[PDB]
Amino acid sequence: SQQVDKIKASYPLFLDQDYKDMLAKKRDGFEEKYPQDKIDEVFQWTTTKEYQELNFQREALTVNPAKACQPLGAVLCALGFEKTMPYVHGSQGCVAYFRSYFNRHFREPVSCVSDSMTEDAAVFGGQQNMKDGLQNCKATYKPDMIAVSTTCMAEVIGDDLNAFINNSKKEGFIPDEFPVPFAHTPSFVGSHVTGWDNMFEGIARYFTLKSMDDKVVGSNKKINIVPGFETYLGNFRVIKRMLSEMGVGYSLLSDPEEVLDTPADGQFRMYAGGTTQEEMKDAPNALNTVLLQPWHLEKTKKFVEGTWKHEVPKLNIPMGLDWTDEFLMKVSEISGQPIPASLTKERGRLVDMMTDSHTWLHGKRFALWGDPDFVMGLVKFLLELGCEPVHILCHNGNKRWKKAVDAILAASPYGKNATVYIGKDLWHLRSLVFTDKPDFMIGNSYGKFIQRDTLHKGKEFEVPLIRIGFPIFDRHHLHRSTTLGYEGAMQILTTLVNSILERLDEETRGMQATDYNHDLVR
Amino acid sequence: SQQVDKIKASYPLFLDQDYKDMLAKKRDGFEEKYPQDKIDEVFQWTTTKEYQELNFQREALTVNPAKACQPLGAVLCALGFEKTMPYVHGSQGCVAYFRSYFNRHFREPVSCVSDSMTEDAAVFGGQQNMKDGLQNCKATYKPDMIAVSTTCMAEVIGDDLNAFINNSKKEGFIPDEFPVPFAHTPSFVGSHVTGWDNMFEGIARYFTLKSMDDKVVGSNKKINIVPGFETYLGNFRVIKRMLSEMGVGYSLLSDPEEVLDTPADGQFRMYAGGTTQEEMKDAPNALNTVLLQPWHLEKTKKFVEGTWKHEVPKLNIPMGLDWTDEFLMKVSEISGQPIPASLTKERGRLVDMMTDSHTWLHGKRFALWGDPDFVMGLVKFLLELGCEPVHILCHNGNKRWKKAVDAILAASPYGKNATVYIGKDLWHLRSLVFTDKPDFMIGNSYGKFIQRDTLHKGKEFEVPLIRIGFPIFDRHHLHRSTTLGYEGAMQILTTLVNSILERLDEETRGMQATDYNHDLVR
Amino acid sequence: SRDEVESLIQEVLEVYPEKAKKNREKHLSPNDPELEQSKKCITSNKKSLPGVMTIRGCAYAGSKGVVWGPIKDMIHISHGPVGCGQYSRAGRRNYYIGTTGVNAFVTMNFTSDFQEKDIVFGGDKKLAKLIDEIETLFPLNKGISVQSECPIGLIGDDIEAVSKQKGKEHGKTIVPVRCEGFRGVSQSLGHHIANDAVRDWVLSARDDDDSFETTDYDVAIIGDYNIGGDAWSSRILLEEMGLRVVAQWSGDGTISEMELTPKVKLNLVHCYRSMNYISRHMEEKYGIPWMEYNFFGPTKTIESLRKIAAQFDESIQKKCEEVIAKYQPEWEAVVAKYRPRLEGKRVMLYVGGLRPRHVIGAYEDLGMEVVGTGYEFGHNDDYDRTLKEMGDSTLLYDDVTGYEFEEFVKKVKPDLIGSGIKEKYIFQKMGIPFRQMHSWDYSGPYHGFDGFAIFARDMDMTLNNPCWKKLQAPWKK
Amino acid sequence: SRDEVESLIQEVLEVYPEKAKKNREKHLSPNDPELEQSKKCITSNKKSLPGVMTIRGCAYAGSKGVVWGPIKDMIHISHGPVGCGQYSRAGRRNYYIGTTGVNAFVTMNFTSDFQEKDIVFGGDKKLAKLIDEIETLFPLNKGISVQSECPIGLIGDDIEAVSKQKGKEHGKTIVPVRCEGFRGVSQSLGHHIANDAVRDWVLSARDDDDSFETTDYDVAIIGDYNIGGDAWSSRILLEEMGLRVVAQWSGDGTISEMELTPKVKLNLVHCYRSMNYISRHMEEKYGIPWMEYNFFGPTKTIESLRKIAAQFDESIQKKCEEVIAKYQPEWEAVVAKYRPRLEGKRVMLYVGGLRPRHVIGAYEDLGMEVVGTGYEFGHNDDYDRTLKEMGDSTLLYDDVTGYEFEEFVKKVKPDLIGSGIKEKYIFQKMGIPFRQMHSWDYSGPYHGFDGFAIFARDMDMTLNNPCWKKLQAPWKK
Ligand code: ICS
Ligand code: CLF
Ligand code: CLF
Ligand SMILES: [Mg+2]
Ligand SMILES: [Mg+2]
């Protein structure tokens, strides 16, 4: 039943007695549900150190992964290019998901197409699809470029993109001059971030490889910036801001900040901004090339050092204080430009905020997950703050990366209780936060079910999620934040401290019980 | 008792049985405490419509005000001037508090002095104090200027600042050329915001009144900006940013953003940035003067229109969409400069965010308090979002202002259930949120005790506080936010929607109870 | 008129090459309500054109996402590379009551996470081991499904063998499903495969077990996946009408309920597209009739209630009228508040296989008018049922492209559009109110009398939101 | 060296005019531990120099903020203009247990909120009406205080008359306090006034009431305002020593407890500065002795415990040693963990009237060294007790200025400073670890054995925080 002056949605509609009674009868009548006490027994069990030992002996089953396919990262990469249409060779089901996934994170349209390969292509291969696809795509959406990725299906049947693209040109499905860079993006290797790397190197080789004779390092007096898989718009913008502020010439390669933040003005803009084709062709002439996320830009790096002969600096992601410092100083060295007073002041303000907030941050224990670069950046910053990163998880990490993180932990007293987990999933993490309870989790929206679970055991066992990462679907507009540089450091610091104080308020809010400590001034 | 490996602070230390038992014995032994049943009975009573009727019939007693003294605003005003020392004529106890109050909000040093008047000054007046004070102050802290305010003591004694300052010059306690603007700031009139207005007009008259012969409106090709009492650093910065972006010459009069955000680099900077003396002297030559907070700049406006002959535009605070629009268009008109594409796009992005978030914001009921301009800005913006401002309270408001807000409510369908309260306090508000429960409160840290109270009645009656206003003492670094312009609109929108979603998560987090609606995607 | 639409189509169709233009003209038509057979107007359930940005998904979405994933007490394995499972994880609001992680698993993602090893050498051994790990770590599961992603068939794995063998080892129902993305053209075949998997592996479990106590008033809700609790707001009305809802498929559904469904007297089918196959099966084998119903808006909820009651005695028919009388003042208040605010407004819909015709009645009950509708994966028997629902010479579009949908909207200039997440933020930039007709815009339910209130509120909040009057800057005039 | 300090002082003192330089040289001194009389080295409790940015507050802070406001079951009216009450509202962490708004009122702000009307015409009538409104809206209050702000005396209001008259009307203790900001030179007189108000209006209430059951072990904690629960971590030790703490003044204190204090056997005074006045009074009238104690760090907590136990029989003395023994392994562990990390480090303190000498013992117990200390409003009998506490030729400063405190720090270069909120963010910018020694940096308690653990942890966390090694940019070197 509904009162019209206060209409109820699913919640709290279904809390009405009529509904509660119905669901009781459904359960008892037909569901043949285990008894509540059996359920409580098993739930208690899943929180034990015993269950964890079994959990961590898994070898086949993955539960609640914290990673995605290669092609996802390929799409995001391609979207950073001017009037470029991401195009994925294979099954159309993939593109439906890719678009949705990004739709929900960015709350923006996301343009991408498929070959729509079917059963016929299993036997005969996907040549005809590529031809008709490339043609139709170009005709219908008027891209200036089409960046080709693969679904697993295409990879397994062993389609040759290079041959398939060329035959499309040869047979007059696409103009010969029309730019169609490509990359193999098998979902059964690496992760979304590996897809970004493969696409990007696919695009950089298309515009440069053949035309390297006239190229001269330094001629354009700029620095190339490769950002990698980035889902915070503040991160593209902050880097641009800091380089402008330094008076450094730069070229941001794969720059989607405009197309994922078009205004609502009465027009639909399918394409907007992006790295130009000429920016790519001229890229070899840059002083140097800097990779913001080195741990997923391994193939890109090999090509830049290898073919463009740029001495790619050994730089960590510019997260936190030390790695933003090191980033800025490298650029100063490469560019000849001094670090300006405005950035020295910004730095000073971050440090001021650290001094202002240290008492609450000190010794707080955290579990965190995400992509390797992000995660290690976060770890580093937590250690600068005096926090304890207790459970560090990277589903798409490796022993080399792990070793690099273990080194960072070893260099700090705050890393004594830290442990790094690669190839593990949020079901593994769930265990860790029950047996070795932190204060908070930092990670993506998938961490809300862990919080749900920890509450179920009791309020004193609840581990609150702080949403930093990707995807974030259950909050609005957090995709607009910054995690890089001093600005990103300041936003994170604020989120961490205020998450601590928010929770402390919640615990002290009980009247004549815990409110002795509900201080006005923290 | 303490375990050294996990030391406990007040919370949760005093939840140990030994302590609980001790406090039970303290209570029963010596406190002669009312019975818990009586207490629960009265608590229940304070939540009723009956109690509210009594509450609202108050005539002498004020409980939990939402306002401060004039001199507070005077100090904040003065701090916006270059190498200026705020100096307050009267009792030193006042300055101790003024400094603390700001210390806790900004987490920055706050410089201010007193002439330390005592009982002797009640009889003989505070002449000698002013003389020695001005001398000592200048000698010790090397200000370029000293801005003089009053404590209530001095006002009641009837000290004449003008005469007292002049005799200090006449008797050689300070140089004659040394600038010592002043203003009467009686705490028993208006509020902190009235103090800002009086100080500012005090400063503007000092540098212009006598030197008005050579002045010509428009000579400057600039716009004066008077900001009023502002405690968000983003608000000073956003206006500066938007004017630069427009290519408009501007003069921000009282600009403390630098001195309340000095870096931590190893130096203590007592003074930093500020409106220059020359900027003040040249102010009359501006095209025009715009007041960001017109409802507490009544005296300033009379002086600007009156003496500088500037046609001050009738503009609301630039909060939300329509009033940022109107602000930018006025500046375009006054300055001759078109509104640039970057700001048209920023506008478009705010509107995008409104379209993206409307479903959650629609029909949410809010109680809010603060200073008049801020409050009406907030109200306006809530109405643009489709929210219902149910309880609007301004302790330091007036019938003319109330009428202006009632007009705004009447112009929108979302103002049907709104009510405006002037001269009421947070104890009045407490009643309102029990009898006519909103979804959230918007206001300063003092609203946490109201939230505490509403929870005590039950979880379904809890009204969560969203901290926007001043002071904010129980969170860190929210003083860095923006409330003005499109930027401020976007920060608020994000805060409001995510406050709704955070609370919805909390309500849906109960397993097999309400978690049917713990959606991954919001 | 008809010729105004017929040349709208031709204008939009100019963008395409010769081969593509021929395909799409068949999938675009004005509505003719007097027509009996929809094959004369439009074609459907054909291959998508490569590179035209279809809104369609795959068979795995149809199987795992739609049919199987909703069953709470079963664990559903996304068998293949990590990906399909991640994007489908809690993407769909098929609501349920359970202790997630313990006795229900809907919003979890179980996957084999194929690497190269497993593509090269096949993942039959990995699948086997994986099932053993589930049984250890998730003892309260009452069954397992294996949702084949694209590689499984391509590498020639025998998941049927593993399922049988591990099924007898652990004494658990393990259902293999060949819902590989590349099969079929859309979600539609995924449904059909999923349906057939239920038949073959689950439904016959209690053929020789009549211990369950039956009545002549037993029914099953078939093809209601309980988006935002739609099935619950449906169920409550049926049990208030004096019927017994023995099973729900598959929103808040369970295996015991699926096994019990062959014992009911009538199958009440909400979604024909997804679940007609198994309904027909139960009519063949078990002799159970089935009828289509519709709980969108008062007009259809009432029609449906009575049409159902008429399949029983006059006791149900009486209870039916008590029910309709109970809710008359509730929906009448809704129409009072909102119809004024929505009267005359024009809508364009694009959804999957059902809702393009079903929701029409609800709009008409708020004085709105659907002028454009289309299905993603709908068949010609879906268009047969849309004919009389839609107005004369309104716009029909099967498997509409990004280009086509946008171009159409610009000429038609609707007040509101109802579609999915990929189309959402496009039309919000053009300044056109948008409601999601899959996820309900994270609202609902929209079924029944209790849902109609929410539906109305939601259309009003969006169509008349103050944001829409603000898209153009005052100065750019 | 003494001469290295004596010319440090003269260097800092150069900035001042002739008149100011003379005043401040009296208020700045090297410490001489062999001296008996502090008037030979330093002067104190004199008027502040105008315009030198003293850290001092007023008599109202001493009365309302320190002494009276902590009493939970009383309502305290800030009588005058709106501000003083607003800035003092919940500014001080005097902890308590109650239902705030019902039976306890500590963190609330009650005020008369004077306008011009009330300055011109006086607020005696307003105060009267205000008290009636309290009695209606706050029936469970057990008493009322009236804290005079600056105007009250200046306009010649008779709050004594109103208090008496309304006191007899409502049958409640209503206490008028003349704590007007302009009286005295600091918080110190505010205390004295507040103390005298208690005597005159509260303490004698049970002179002819011996119904209260007494023991030989009854005591009162006097001058512990329970910052962060300091009084509680103090009390628990006294009750474990077999004493009965009949009253606390005024942290978590109550009116009944104040009234009961003349029945105790001994007054245990933590803060001499604030509450020696009333202690002396009770020795005169009621014959109750009193002694100073100190529960900062093990060394003093032990000394104090034993010194107190020695005032009773051998039963207490025994219980004392049980207590000491119970907590020995706890504080020993604290010293084990932290002393290594803090050994050798140098501190400068500046607080109000007590803590500049009291906390020294706690620092020395973690191997630290206080090299600079000063009081805001302390008297010469406070410096008398600081003499032997501080090292030889360490730095003493009464009513230190902003300039002086900064300049001193630059030469001394301490590892840590302990002071108030106004000094906090100054020294954090210079790169010098800072702890608040009023509010405890929103931590605590720091008293007792349970407090010492927290104290140690807090000093370590701040002094060795990683933030401090990062202040200078790598490039600007
Ligand atoms: S009362 Fe005094 S200034 Fe003895 S006015 Fe002040 S809560 Fe200080 S050194 Mo703030 S004489 Fe208490 C004090 Fe000491 S407010 Fe507290 S810390 S022990
Ligand atoms: S059509 Fe459908 S969604 Fe596509 S794969 Fe095939 S079953 Fe799945 Fe999967 S991991 Fe990624 S999204 Fe694909 S490339 Fe493979
Ligand atoms: S020394 Fe002390 S705090 Fe000062 S007034 Fe006097 S009692 Fe009070 Fe009050 S309202 Fe403002 S802060 Fe002052 S000018 Fe009056
Ligand atoms: Mg958006
Ligand atoms: Mg600071």
Author numbering:
A (entry chain D), B (entry chain B): 2 to 523
C (entry chain C), D (entry chain A): 5 to 481
Text from the published report:
In all nitrogenase isozymes, H-subunits form a homodimeric reductase component (‘HH’) that transiently associates with and transfers electrons to a catalytic core.
Anc1A and Anc1B are the same age, whereas Anc2 is reconstructed from an older phylogenetic node. As an additional distinction, Anc1A and Anc2 contain an ancestral D-subunit protein complexed with WT H- and K-subunit proteins. Specifically, all ancestors crystallized at pH 6.5, which is unusually acidic for nitrogenase. In addition, all ancestral proteins crystallized in space group P 212121, which differs from the space groups for the same proteins in A. vinelandii NifDK (i.e., WT; space group P 21), Clostridium pasteurianum Nif (space group P 21), and Klebsiella pneumoniae NifDK (space group C 2). Global structural differences between the ancestors and WT A. vinelandii DDKK are relatively minor and within the range of variation for available extant structures. Among the two hybrid ancestors, the RMSD between Anc2 and WT (0.24 Å) is smaller than that between Anc1A and WT (0.31 Å). Notably, a non-conserved Nif-D α-helix (positions 165–174 in Anc1B) lies within interacting distance of HH. This helix contains several substitutions across all ancestors, albeit the positioning of polar amino acids differs among Anc1A, Anc1B, and Anc2. Herein, the D-subunit S165A substitution is consistently present across all ancestors and may influence interactions with HH S175 in the ATP-bound complex, potentially reducing stability.
